[PDB]
């Protein structure tokens, strides 16, 4: 595998024009096949060495007709010109045609069977005007030859076979055809006997497909990594992915899609679907940044994002506006902007807020505070003096890695008395806290504004189950509920870390007990369909691929694979 | 000036226990997480771990988990390391680097030499 | 978690060389990238913070780019005081931690 214009598959087109009396061109030796055309025009070298090229397939084509170019290489002073074309084992040429024409010391040009090497019959072949004194070919050539060698002859292969094998065979009889992965002829009815290869190739065995990366095994009725597992490299299957390439399921791109994101569990990076939204990082602001405050003129960069590299800043001025009337107010809807950021690495700064929005709802997905970038004296969540704000509203925060917390003036703010800032405040309290002056708590307590009753000891970020530390019972979506669907309901559920999850499809709902007890389908009472094995399927293996090929089996009666 | 000053390096048999100093100056020690990274005497620039301005978060290498402890005294502007039963693969030179702006070691130690041999 | 740097590279005083760093989405994907320079018998300091930024000391000559998951030390303007080794480092997600590259050693010819 190499570019065009050493390996042995040549990628684009083998491009060779205008080059001195000697070249080094002796690292042409290794080159079995050409995936584009073969251009070799203006030259004064005397032999171009291809001696191992076989196939030229021409899936794009010189002068929209040719596949093989050669002109005008020769001089009409000096005496250095092409003589010899050694392309002693050029068998095939997939598509399109062959023009060699004013080369004016090339011989055994007019001796060569190129409708054997060329198979696309509509192509133009063109070649005349080229060597006059040359010799006859080698007694052993038969008569055609691409030079005065015993190894220099043309091999013919192609023959007129039986209309069981349409064009693609190696021999008359009906019984000598070639594989259904062949571009072209064949050596043998074997796999590993084509010329050239019409997908990939494993390792000279030409299939449609290289080897799985999740094979079938006999042992757990199941899917299992393959030992061979040879990933798409273009035209080459490879166990590992090249340089810098990512593994993507079954082809090495160069880089993940848009939809998934290059994650590394089995050592090699592999592209993984992002779930929902790939992760990203954005610039923020504060100290580092451009910008002392977000506005309207940053609030449109933070789309799709999930992590801060940085801070964020919210000042009165970005709110409301500009001094100097050169930004305009910001939009309130567009804060909506954050519901994606899940982490800040420095610190969050609420120095001013919609009127109308009465707590950070926005940020109800924002897990993590880092706290790696510090704001005035120290602190890695400031808000203050916010006489809007209801409730904090980070249903989604549960660590902020360091700093001090600064709370204050914000008068109408509740819910935030009960919490329990160690379970969320990582490093010890001590003196990190500076919340005081906002609703008396006494004021809360009388007005009902505490926390949910179904939550725990934890604390809260306002009303509601959802706005909830730590459930009592379990959590559905973010939300505190008592029971989850073990017994009774739809879709069945069952529990993990006092969080509720759906059972895997094709297990019906058992009454009376509980459905499931893992995720996958491999933990049901029993299956609403099928049973390969200790799972539970929707269908038998139709046509799936193991370790040795299609694998199926009928329904035994009992539903059981 | 801005200077993080090391110590308590030297030589020391396999087995043996360690605590290394870094004393802080120049800045507030206390906004910034703090690192360690050694370097072994020809090997490259290998990462120990780091702890969190307040001493919260702390993560180390999986070639020094459950030996090393990494801890900081912010009223004395001075980061710790407790390099507890010592290897002869722990043979380097500490480097005590802050965190910077965009997590970026701007200041670092002068050295302190560790040397673990039989 | 280590970052992949070429083990060496070489030029010729007034000439441009390139140090490539290649990484993962787990770190300089989702954080910012950081080279330091290390004089022989010489504790490292920072020569590039923040993907492009150069502190009050280091020339203009330096410059440092990120595309990605990798990022590029490019040197225009070769010296011989520039003979020393280049890490590159940036903080890691998934496994919390600093991951560092294997190290690139600049040999400055003439």
């Known amino acids: 595998v190499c570019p065009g214009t050493r390996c042995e598959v040549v990628m684009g087109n083998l491009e060779i024009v205008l080059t001195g009396h000697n070249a080094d061109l002796s690292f042409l030796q290794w080159i079995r096949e050409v995936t584009g055309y073969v251009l070799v025009a203006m030259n004064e070298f005397s032999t171009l060495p291809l001696p191992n090229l076989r196939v030229v397939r021409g899936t794009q084509v010189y002068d929209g007709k040719f596949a093989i170019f050669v002109m005008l290489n020769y001089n009409t002073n000096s005496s250095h010109a092409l003589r010899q074309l050694r392309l002693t084992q050029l068998t095939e040429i997939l598509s399109g045609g062959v023009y060699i024409e004013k080369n004016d010391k090339l011989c055994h040009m007019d001796t060569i069977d190129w409708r054997d090497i060329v198979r696309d019959r509509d192509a133009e072949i063109v070649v005349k005007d080229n060597g006059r004194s040359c010799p006859p070919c080698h007694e052993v050539c038969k008569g055609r030859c691409w030079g005065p060698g015993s190894e220099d002859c043309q091999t013919l292969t192609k023959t007129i076979c039986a209309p069981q094998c349409n064009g693609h065979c190696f021999g008359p009889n009906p019984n000598q055809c070639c594989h259904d992965e062949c571009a072209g002829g064949c050596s043998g009815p074997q796999d590993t006997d084509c010329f050239a290869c019409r997908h990939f190739n494993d390792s000279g065995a030409c299939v449609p497909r290289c080897p799985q990366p999740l094979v079938y095994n006999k042992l757990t009725f199941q899917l299992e990594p393959n030992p061979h597992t040879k990933y798409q490299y273009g035209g080459v299957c490879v166990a590992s992915c090249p340089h810098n390439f990512v593994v993507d399921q079954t082809s090495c791109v160069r880089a993940c899609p848009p939809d998934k994101m290059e994650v590394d569990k089995n050592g090699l990076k592999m592209c993984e679907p992002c779930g929902g939204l790939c992760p990203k990082a954005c610039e923020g602001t504060g100290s580092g940044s451009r910008f002392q405050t977000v506005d309207s003129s940053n609030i449109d960069g933070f789309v799709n994002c999930t992590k801060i590299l940085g801070n964020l800043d919210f000042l009165i001025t970005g709110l409301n506006g500009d001094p100097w009337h050169k930004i305009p107010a910001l939009d309130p809807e567009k804060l909506n902007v954050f519901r994606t950021v899940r982490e800040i690495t420095g610190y969050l700064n609420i120095q001013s807020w919609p009127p109308h929005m009465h707590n950070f709802s926005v940020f109800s997905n924002l897990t993590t505070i880092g706290g790696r970038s510090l704001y005035n004296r120290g602190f890695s969540l400031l808000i203050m003096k916010n006489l809007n704000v209801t409730s904090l509203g980070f249903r989604s925060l549960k660590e902020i890695s360091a700093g001090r917390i600064y709370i204050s003036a914000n008068r109408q703010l509740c819910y935030h008395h009960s919490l329990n800032w160690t379970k969320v405040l990582r490093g010890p309290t001590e003196e990190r806290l500076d919340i005081k002056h906002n609703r008396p708590r006494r004021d809360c307590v009388a007005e009902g504004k505490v926390c949910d009753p179904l939550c725990s000891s934890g604390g809260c970020w306002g009303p509601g189950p959802g706005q909830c530390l730590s459930c009592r019972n379990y959590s559905r979506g973010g939300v505190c509920v008592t029971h989850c669907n073990f017994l009774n309901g739809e879709p069945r559920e069952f529990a993990h870390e006092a969080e509720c999850f759906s059972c895997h499809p094709e297990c019906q709902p058992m009454e009376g007990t509980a459905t499931c007890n893992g995720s996958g389908s491999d933990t049901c009472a029993q299956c609403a369909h099928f049973r390969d094995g200790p799972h539970c399927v929707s269908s038998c293996p139709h046509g799936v691929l193991g370790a040795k090929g299609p694998i199926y089996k009928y329904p035994d009666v009992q539903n059981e694979c | 000036e801005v200077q993080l000053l090391e110590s308590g390096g030297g030589l020391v048999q396999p087995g043996g226990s360690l605590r290394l100093s870094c004393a802080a100056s120049g800045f507030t020690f206390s906004y910034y997480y703090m690192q360690w990274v050694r370097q072994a005497p020809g090997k490259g620039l290998e990462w120990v771990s780091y702890i969190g301005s307040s001493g919260g978060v702390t993560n180390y290498a999986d070639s020094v988990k459950g030996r090393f402890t990494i801890s900081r005294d912010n009223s004395k502007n001075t980061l710790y390391l407790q390099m507890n039963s010592l290897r002869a693969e722990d043979t380097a030179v500490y480097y005590c680097?802050?965190?910077?702006?965009?997590?970026?070691?701007?200041?670092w130690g002068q050295g302190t030499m560790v040397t673990v041999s039989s | 978690s280590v970052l992949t740097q070429p083990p060496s590279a070489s030029g010729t005083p007034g000439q441009r060389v390139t140090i490539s760093c290649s990484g993962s989405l787990s770190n300089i994907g989702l954080n910012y990238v950081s080279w330091y320079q290390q004089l022989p018998g010489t504790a490292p300091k920072l020569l590039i913070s923040?993907?492009?930024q150069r502190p009050s000391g280091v020339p203009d000559r330096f410059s440092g780019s990120k595309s990605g998951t990798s990022a590029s030390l490019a040197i225009s303007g070769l010296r011989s005081e520039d003979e020393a080794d280049y890490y590159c480092?940036?903080?890691?997600?998934?496994?919390?931690?600093?991951?560092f590259g294997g190290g690139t050693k600049l040999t400055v010819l003439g």
């Open positions: 923040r993907n492009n």
């Open positions: 680097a802050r965190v910077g702006l965009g997590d970026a070691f701007d200041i």
């Open positions: 480092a940036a903080w890691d997600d998934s496994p919390p931690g600093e991951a």
